[PDB]
Design a protein around this ligand. Structure first.
Ligand code: BCL
Ligand code: BCL
Ligand SMILES: CC[C@H]1c2cc3[nH]c4c(c3C)C(=O)[C@H](C(=O)OC)c4c3nc(cc4[nH]c(cc(n2)[C@@H]1C)c(C(C)=O)c4C)[C@@H](C)[C@@H]3CCC(=O)OC/C=C(\C)CCC[C@H](C)CCC[C@H](C)CCCC(C)C
Ligand SMILES: CC[C@H]1c2cc3[nH]c4c(c3C)C(=O)[C@H](C(=O)OC)c4c3nc(cc4[nH]c(cc(n2)[C@@H]1C)c(C(C)=O)c4C)[C@@H](C)[C@@H]3CCC(=O)OC/C=C(\C)CCC[C@H](C)CCC[C@H](C)CCCC(C)C
Ligand SMILES: COC1=C(OC)C(=O)C(C/C=C(\C)CC/C=C(\C)CC/C=C(\C)CC/C=C(\C)CC/C=C(\C)CC/C=C(\C)CC/C=C(/C)CC/C=C(\C)CC/C=C(\C)CCC=C(C)C)=C(C)C1=O
Ligand SMILES: COC(C)(C)C(=O)C/C=C(\C)CC/C=C(\C)CC/C=C(\C)CCCC/C(C)=C/CCC(C)CC/C=C(\C)CCC=C(C)C
Ligand SMILES: COC(C)(C)C(=O)C/C=C(\C)CC/C=C(\C)CC/C=C(\C)CCCC/C(C)=C/CCC(C)CC/C=C(\C)CCC=C(C)C
Ligand SMILES: COC(C)(C)C(=O)C/C=C(\C)CC/C=C(\C)CC/C=C(\C)CCCC/C(C)=C/CCC(C)CC/C=C(\C)CCC=C(C)C
Ligand SMILES: COC(C)(C)C(=O)C/C=C(\C)CC/C=C(\C)CC/C=C(\C)CCCC/C(C)=C/CCC(C)CC/C=C(\C)CCC=C(C)C
Ligand SMILES: COC(C)(C)C(=O)C/C=C(\C)CC/C=C(\C)CC/C=C(\C)CCCC/C(C)=C/CCC(C)CC/C=C(\C)CCC=C(C)C
Ligand SMILES: COC(C)(C)C(=O)C/C=C(\C)CC/C=C(\C)CC/C=C(\C)CCCC/C(C)=C/CCC(C)CC/C=C(\C)CCC=C(C)C
Ligand SMILES: COC(C)(C)C(=O)C/C=C(\C)CC/C=C(\C)CC/C=C(\C)CCCC/C(C)=C\CCC(C)CC/C=C(\C)CCC=C(C)C
Ligand SMILES: [Fe+3]
Lengths: 325, 255, 51, 273, 44, 51, 44, 51, 44, 51, 44, 51, 44, 51
């Protein structure tokens, strides 16, 4: 069959690229030293590094390391400092949020103090990383779309961790730091407040997540289809339209009656991805503070389905018949 | 919590506000994507009576690098072809077109190319982006099979020549083109093949798109050390047109 | 006003006609459906009761 | 009404079947053999759905529910009011999806490009068929499929998830969720980078691929390239679909007990003291 | 004079006259329907 | 009224005919279905009851 | 003379004549059907 | 009514014929299926009941 | 003269004649089938 | 107040007309719907209770 | 004179006059409607 | 205090006017809804209470 | 002379002079409405 | 204190004005909502409690 352009047939290697520069002097903070990976060269680029080391990055790294070490050492101490038992129960341990009886006051170290300290460190680290991603775009002379799309997810992060506990007046409304405990928190939160399926904003966030996954599948397939016309060089196609863009647009116009441009599809992708955490945070912020039962809300607003048939196994079969006796 | 009227509460207000915002956002997104290809035309080249429910957007300006000027969209079509050898198969709209001469030589159908600028694409330094491997210092093969020196087999099992060079992308360290030296029987000079249409084996390189007799009419580059966007388009599309026009059985229904 | 004919020097008649055609039918359908959702003005149930 | 560059692409040929019998356009849409089949199947399915809605007693979009038969009917046919309409609509939907994929194949062949999009759509078709065909076939009854209702096809998901006590402990569910999240993040980053490169601050020149490569190498220390990102996104979406199908298909016919108990192999390894 | 669509004054006058005729016909039919409905089942 | 024929100087008949046909068939189907969702005008159930 | 579809005045008149001729037949068939239905099961 | 033949100066038969061919079969299939879903007009269960 | 499809008047008349000939046969067969069905199981 | 005609030297009338129409229709529909949600200003229920 | 849309003073005056006439007609109709409604069932 | 006209040299009026309109309408609607939310300042219920 | 939007002294003066009239009319209407509401149902 | 004007010799007024407006409005709204959230300072309910 024809070449499908999933793996590269032959690789070439030249002198390492150090990066572009301007009067802002990005070179003064970049590291020296690069590597090449032939295993990754089958899919993408082979050069590894260098990286830019500012102050926001160092602060974020140190503070996130502190949070990681606090959580890990608390989990280790909870098991008796036994390394085999620490390894055995790794997925089951956690650092629990404070008890409901303490409200918004600072709890003791045994019942949530370390949780608050680690949460403060994690918040500082995340904000430092966001500031770094803004500063890099400001110094290379580019737009700030990356910072906005990160802020989109930071919004849901903050809603799940900071704003909602303050609105509900308790530090016990946060999420524990664990693998299985956090899934347990998800399920318990869903059960406690009715059914989260009947929250309209959860449905909207699900809609946008599905749309975003569908849109990347479509765009990846489309770009790999027209790569024989140099379709992967999107910027030059935007500045000077070629046949690849025309064919890509005509495919979708003949398929579903409307199409896009080489620059407009990226706007669609940006918005579908960004709209998910925003709707999710808006929906989460209204739970408990405004609505306490979502199934009752749906019933009162008349979009809860009704069933006619009966309940129970004895209405459909027999216990002996099920066993085959 | 209480309700403003009836069953209307804060959640309903948020939902309706989101409805309005989403409607406006959909309008904006659809209008932003109408900067190329408008206004619509009929099959005779005249402006159609129907133009849709979305009006055209306003103008935006792009400032290009290397002193190439500015681009304003939406505007006139500068990539339009002038004289196409095509024939209508019906008196109204909605029916296909019939090639007048040789579709592979006339650049129609799957062999169509766009009238791009007749200048090479430049990298950050202002050098041509795609350069032959014999003029790039410090570049070498690091993995895979080296295709240089191997014979080239066409789509019908004919050997036309040997691979003599590769044209690489220095900025991104990727191979773009494979150069071919033709035997005197099958033509003269050298031709380029894009890397996306070849299959390198241990003893041969196969091009299934076109046959042996179609190799002498591949468009040639004017300069031996660089290629322009227009030439790349014509070369690359000529190679794509063979998937349909290289044989009569590729055009008729497969059933 | 006697000079209300100048609205056609600001707006394109085709788009206006299409939008108004959609709007009128949507409004009529909504009004008929709202009538059907009551008790004093549902004509199917009124016919059923009087039979 | 054509685009200003569309006319030269509107040539004849590239049909799998039909020749010039169905080779024309209706507005922007392209018609063929599979376009005719798609139109027939979709119209029949929609009209049957609205007939079932009329016979149910409600036209509310939120409340329409067409449900599969009872488990006692097995793999046989049920009365059209007690769940047979669901089977007919399922057949129509399968036919329509396959016809849509083959029409995409024909359009790709006519335009002279690759066949990646139909291959990607085949994975979603596979997931749907696994949901409505393969799992009910293995379990032994057509009543294991989800109903055709906007709000009634979520109660089925809830009850099926709670049939194993804690569905979050399914490892394939974990893999699929991770793939979904990674795909969304990658799409956001790609869109943001392209838009920022093409839209600089006012009064500044546009950028190129070298600028993007530098940015991500400064940001995180690695850049995948303008060609590897599309491969990565396509692979992530396909993997998400495949692992969703695997997770749903292993829940019923292979595992029967609760999902948390599956980890007893790790919790009871002989190596532990 | 000002014209965003390329039309002239006379064409706009003609178009508005025909549109107005159609609007009055529609309104008259609606008025008859409303009067009949009110006679059959009065609201207010 | 005598100048209603000038609508075809604005709208292309080819598109108008297709849109009108689709609209008419959809409206007829919707009405015929709405009559069947009641009990007084459902002719199948009436035929069943009268036998 | 305004024309967006490229037609002439006489062409528009000749088209409208046949259009109205068909519309009246459609309306007459619908009226007969409505009369028969009302005779069968009234609604007013 | 005597000038109805002018529709073929507006529409090409090659598209109208296929549209009508799809429409008629769709109508026939739906109607037969709708009949098969009732109790008074289902001719398969009638034969079983009558025998 | 108005002609979008490129046909003449006589060709359109002949095409309409054949089309009506087919339509009448279809309608007659449908009418016979409906009469037989009504005699078998009335719905009025 | 006499210089209020200069507001058309800032906004394009084509945008403002569409925005005003959409806003006016939405406001009228919202107010009419808010009236129906009460019990003293529902004319359907008032007519029903007056017979 | 400052102008962002391309209109001149006289055209703006004419437009504003037409717009104000339409606004006053709408306001008079609304006043009649509100008066009738208040007479039928008064708030305040 | 008398040099307040210079604000237009810093802000673009085109954007400011649109933002002002949106903000003013939203604030007025929100205040009216908040007034309706109470039980003493709801003028729709007072009419029924005074009847 | 500091300028960022492209206007002059006289143009800004005229714009503000026009704006303040509408501002004061809106404020006067609001004051009358608030006074009437307070007389109807005081909140202090 | 006398040389406080040299803050414009560092900061861009265009961003400062917008940030100040947004911050002032948000602060005022938050304080009003906080006052409304209590029981002693809710002036809407005080009018009803005094009637
Ligand atoms: C109590 C509930 C359980 C649970 C129970 C289940 C069950 C049970 C299921 C999963 C499934 C999934 N779960 Mg889980 N799951 C839970 C909660 C979660 C959470 C979370 C808490 O955050 C997440 C992130 C997920 C996410 C997921 C995905 C991994 C997966 C979704 C399938 C999919 O997208 O296939 C997408 C594929 C498709 C089906 C798309 C089909 C599209 C077709 C082919 C085309 C449509 C054409 C259309 C009709 C055209 C008409 C439109 C015209 C314009 C008119 N689950 C909880 C813990 N989960 C589902 C799964 O894996 O399914 C295989 C599933 O059934
Ligand atoms: C029993 C389970 C309940 C349920 C309970 C919940 C709850 C509870 C929630 C979700 C939420 C979501 N649900 Mg649900 N949900 C259910 C069933 C489903 C099903 C299904 C059955 O198929 C689906 C498709 C989903 C899926 C979803 C998503 C649509 C949504 C997550 C938003 C998002 O962007 O997450 C992506 C995640 C994020 C963006 C988190 C923020 C990330 C930040 C930025 C991390 C910072 C980095 C970190 C500090 C550093 C790490 C170290 C590095 C290596 C350096 N739910 C059932 C009904 N669902 C969320 C939501 O918004 O709902 C309204 C939510 O809170
Ligand atoms: C999903 C995105 C997250 C991410 C990704 C990421 N970082 C990366 C990579 C990736 C994918 C690399 O490939 C690159 C790397 O070198 O990986 C080994 C790297 C990197 N990001 C780093 C740090 C880093 N990134 C951060 C950020 C992030 N990392 C993101 C949040 C952070 C945080 C959160 O604070 C830190 C601390 C560096 C460790 C490294 C930058 C590389 C550098 O400066 O020098 C590397 C080059 C060499 C001297 C030689 C290569 C290194 C090899 C490990 C040694 C020899 C191996 C051989 C040459 C081939 C390697 C085989 C492959 C299988 C890797
Ligand atoms: C549009 C919404 C989507 C989204 C977007 C998004 N996320 C983002 C961004 C964007 C636009 C970034 O720019 C930012 C980024 O850097 O991307 C590369 C990021 C990011 N989103 C992340 C995670 C994440 N995103 C998620 C989801 C989403 N983010 C949404 C689907 C999720 C989930 C739950 O689905 C997660 C878990 C990070 C990878 C990164 C944020 C990096 C950050 O904040 O780092 C702070 C630093 C620390 C906490 C220090 C960590 C120290 C470690 C102990 C060691 C150092 C790191 C090392 C690389 C790891 C270990 C390596 C081993 C070899 C030792
Ligand atoms: C860089 O590159 C890229 C591009 O480019 C630059 C792109 O753009 C895109 C594309 C991306 C976008 C445009 C972004 C937006 C996309 C999304 C949000 C994805 C989600 C999409 C949707 C929700 C819309 C999809 C809609 C669908 C599938 C329905 C449309 C289909 C129809 C209406 C029917 C199809 C028509 C057929 C089969 C032909 C008709 C059949 C016949 C037999 C013809 C005979 C005649 C008749 C039957 C009668 C006449 C028929 C009529 C009028 C048809 C209508 C009928 C009705 C009943 C209504 C991508 C990815 C890309 O990466
Ligand atoms: C009770 O509480 C709640 C929240 C529920 C509420 O109900 C709150 C409600 C509000 C807060 C409501 C607020 C309402 C408003 C502020 C309403 C404002 C309304 C207007 C300003 C309306 C203006 C209408 C203007 C009209 C109809 C103009 C028409 C003009 C024309 C038809 C003429 C068109 C012009 C032409 C042709 C120009 C001539 C052309 C040339 C070329 C010269
Ligand atoms: C009760 O509460 C609720 C919310 C439930 C409601 O029901 C609220 C409802 C409303 C608020 C409803 C509001 C409704 C409106 C404001 C409706 C307005 C409607 C119109 C203004 C309709 C106008 C229609 C005009 C027409 C049809 C006129 C003419 C048409 C033609 C003449 C067609 C032919 C056209 C030709 C020939 C063009 C001439 C061409 C030439 C070249 C000369
Ligand atoms: C009860 O409440 C609910 C909501 C449930 C309802 O049911 C509400 C329903 C409605 C509100 C329904 C409203 C319905 C309408 C407004 C329907 C209107 C329908 C029409 C105006 C139909 C018109 C049809 C006209 C036709 C078919 C006329 C002629 C056609 C032809 C003559 C075809 C031939 C044409 C030729 C030859 C022209 C060519 C001539 C040349 C010279 C070239
Ligand atoms: C009851 O409620 C529900 C919703 C359930 C319903 O069932 C609703 C149902 C409806 C609303 C149904 C509506 C049905 C219709 C409107 C049906 C209409 C049907 C037609 C108009 C049919 C027309 C058929 C015409 C035919 C068969 C004509 C010709 C056929 C030929 C084979 C002739 C071919 C012509 C040639 C060869 C001409 C060649 C000539 C040359 C010169 C080349
Ligand atoms: C109770 O607690 C809660 C939180 C619930 C609240 O309700 C809190 C509420 C607040 C904190 C509210 C605060 C509100 C404000 C601060 C409001 C401020 C409002 C204004 C400053 C309004 C100004 C309005 C100005 C207007 C309308 C001016 C002019 C309008 C015109 C239409 C005229 C302009 C025309 C021009 C310039 C023509 C152009 C001229 C040329 C020559 C071209
Ligand atoms: C109790 O425990 C918990 C954790 C709960 C706490 O609450 C802990 C809290 C702390 C540990 C708090 C610690 C707080 C501090 C250390 C606070 C320090 C604060 C300062 C140092 C404040 C400095 C403020 C200075 C100010 C306001 C200066 C203003 C200057 C001007 C307005 C003049 C501007 C100058 C110009 C324009 C110069 C122009 C000159 C030219 C040449 C251009
Ligand atoms: C000891 O051994 C060594 C050294 C090897 C280790 O260090 C081992 C370490 C480990 C084995 C570590 C393992 C760690 C995990 C398994 C971690 C898992 C973490 C999570 C799942 C974290 C989730 C976090 C957050 C979530 C789900 C949502 C929202 C959170 C926040 C918004 C947090 C921010 C908090 C705020 C703003 C409150 C701060 C409080 C104030 C008073 C300011
Ligand atoms: Fe892309």
């Amino acid at each position: 069959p024809e070449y499908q352009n999933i793996f590269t047939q032959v690789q070439v290697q030249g002198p390492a690229e150090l990066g572009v520069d301007n009067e802002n002097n990005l070179t003064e903070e970049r590291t020296t030293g690069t590597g090449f990976s032939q295993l990754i060269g089958w899919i993408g680029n082979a050069q590894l590094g260098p990286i830019y080391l500012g102050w926001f990055g160092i602060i974020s790294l140190v503070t996130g390391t502190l949070w990681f070490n606090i959580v890990g050492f608390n989990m280790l101490s909870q098991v008796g400092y036994s390394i085999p038992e620490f390894i055995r129960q790794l997925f089951w341990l956690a650092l629990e949020p404070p008890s409901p009886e303490y409200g918004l006051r600072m709890p003791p170290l045994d019942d949530g103090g370390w949780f608050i300290i680690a949460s403060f460190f994690l918040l500082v680290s995340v904000i430092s990383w966001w500031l770094r991603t803004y500063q890099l775009a400001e110094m290379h002379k580019m737009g700030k779309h990356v910072a906005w799309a990160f802020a989109a997810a930071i919004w849901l992060f903050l809603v799940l961790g900071l704003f909602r506990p303050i609105l509900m007046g308790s530090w016990s409304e946060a999420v524990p730091y664990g693998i299985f405990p956090h899934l347990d928190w998800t399920t318990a939160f869903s059960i406690r407040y009715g059914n989260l399926y009947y929250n309209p904003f959860h449905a909207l966030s699900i809609v946008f997540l599905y749309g975003s996954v569908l849109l990347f599948a479509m765009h990846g397939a489309t770009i790999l289809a027209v790569t024989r016309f140099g379709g992967d060089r999107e910027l030059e196609q935007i500045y000077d339209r070629g046949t690849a863009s025309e064919r890509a647009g005509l495919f979708w116009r003949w398929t579903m009656g409307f199409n896009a441009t080489m620059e407009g599809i990226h706007r669609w992708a940006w918005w579908f991805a960004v709209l998910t955490p925003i709707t999710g945070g808006i929906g989460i912020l209204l739970t408990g503070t405004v609505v306490d039962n979502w199934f009752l809300w749906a019933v009162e607003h008349n979009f809860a389905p009704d069933y006619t048939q009966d309940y129970g196994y004895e209405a459909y079969t027999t216990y002996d018949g099920f066993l085959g006796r | 919590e209480e309700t403003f009227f009836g069953n209307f509460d804060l959640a309903s207000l948020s939902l309706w506000l989101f409805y309005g915002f989403f409607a406006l956002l959909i309008y904006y997104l659809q209008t932003e994507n109408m900067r190329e290809g408008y206004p619509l035309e009929d099959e005779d080249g005249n402006t159609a009576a129907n133009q849709g429910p979305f009006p055209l957007p306003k103008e935006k300006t792009f400032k290009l690098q290397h002193g190439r000027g500015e681009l304003t969209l939406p505007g006139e079509d500068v990539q339009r072809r002038d004289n196409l050898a095509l024939r209508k198969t019906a008196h109204g709209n909605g029916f296909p077109m019939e090639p007048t001469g040789d579709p592979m030589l006339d650049g129609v159908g799957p062999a169509s190319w766009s009238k791009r600028r007749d200048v090479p694409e430049l990298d950050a330094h202002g050098h041509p982006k795609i350069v032959p491997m014999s003029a790039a210092e410090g570049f070498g093969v690091s993995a895979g099979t080296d295709p240089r020196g191997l014979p080239v087999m066409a789509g019908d099992g004919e050997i036309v020549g040997l691979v003599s060079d590769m044209w690489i992308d220095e900025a991104e360290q990727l191979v773009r083109y494979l150069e071919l030296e033709l035997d005197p029987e099958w033509g003269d000079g050298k031709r380029l093949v894009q890397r996306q249409m070849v299959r390198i084996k241990s003893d041969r390189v196969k091009v299934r798109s076109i046959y042996g007799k179609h190799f002498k009419n591949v468009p040639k580059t004017k300069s031996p050390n660089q290629v322009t966007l227009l030439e790349e388009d014509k070369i690359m599309a000529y190679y794509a047109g063979g998937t349909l026009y290289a044989d009569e059985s590729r055009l008729e229904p497969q059933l | 006003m006697s000079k209300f004919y100048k609205i056609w020097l600001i707006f394109d008649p085709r788009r206006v006609f299409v939008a108004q055609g959609v709007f009128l039918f949507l409004l009529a359908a909504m009004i008929h459906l709202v009538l059907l959702s009551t008790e004093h003005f549902n004509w199917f149930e009124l016919a059923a009761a009087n039979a | 009404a054509l685009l200003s560059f569309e006319r030269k692409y509107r040539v004849r040929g590239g049909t799998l079947i039909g020749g010039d019998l169905f080779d024309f356009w209706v507005g922007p849409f392209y018609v063929g053999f599979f376009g005719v089949t798609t139109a027939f199947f979709a119209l029949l399915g929609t009209i049957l759905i609205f007939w079932g809605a009329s016979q149910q007693g409600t036209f509310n979009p939120w409340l329409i529910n067409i449900a599969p038969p009872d488990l006692s009917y097995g793999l046989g046919m049920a009365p059209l009011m007690e769940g047979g309409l669901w089977q007919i609509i399922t057949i129509c939907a399968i036919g329509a999806f396959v016809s849509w994929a083959l029409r995409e194949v024909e359009i790709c062949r006519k335009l002279g490009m690759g066949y990646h999009v139909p291959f990607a759509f085949s994975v979603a078709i596979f997931a749907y068929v696994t949901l409505v065909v393969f799992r009910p076939l293995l379990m032994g009854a057509w009543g294991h499929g989800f109903p055709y209702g906007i709000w009634s096809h979520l109660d089925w998901v809830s009850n099926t998830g709670y049939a194993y006590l804690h569905f979050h402990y399914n490892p394939a569910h974990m893999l699929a969720v991770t793939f979904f999240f990674t795909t969304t993040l990658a799409l956001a980053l790609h869109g943001a980078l392209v838009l920022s490169a093409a839209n600089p601050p006012k009064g500044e020149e546009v950028k190129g691929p070298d600028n993007e490569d530098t940015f991500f190498r400064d940001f995180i220390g690695y850049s995948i390239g303008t060609l590897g990102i599309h491969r990565v996104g396509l692979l992530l979406a396909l993997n998400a679909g495949f692992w969703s199908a695997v997770c749903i298909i292993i829940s019923g016919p292979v595992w029967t007990k609760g999902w948390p108990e599956w980890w007893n192999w790790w919790l009871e390894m002989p190596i532990w003291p | 004079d000002l014209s965003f669509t390329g039309l002239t004054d006379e064409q706009a006058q003609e178009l508005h006259s025909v549109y107005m005729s159609g609007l009055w016909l529609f309104s008259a039919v609606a008025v008859v329907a409303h009067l009949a409905t009110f006679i059959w089942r009065p609201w207010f």
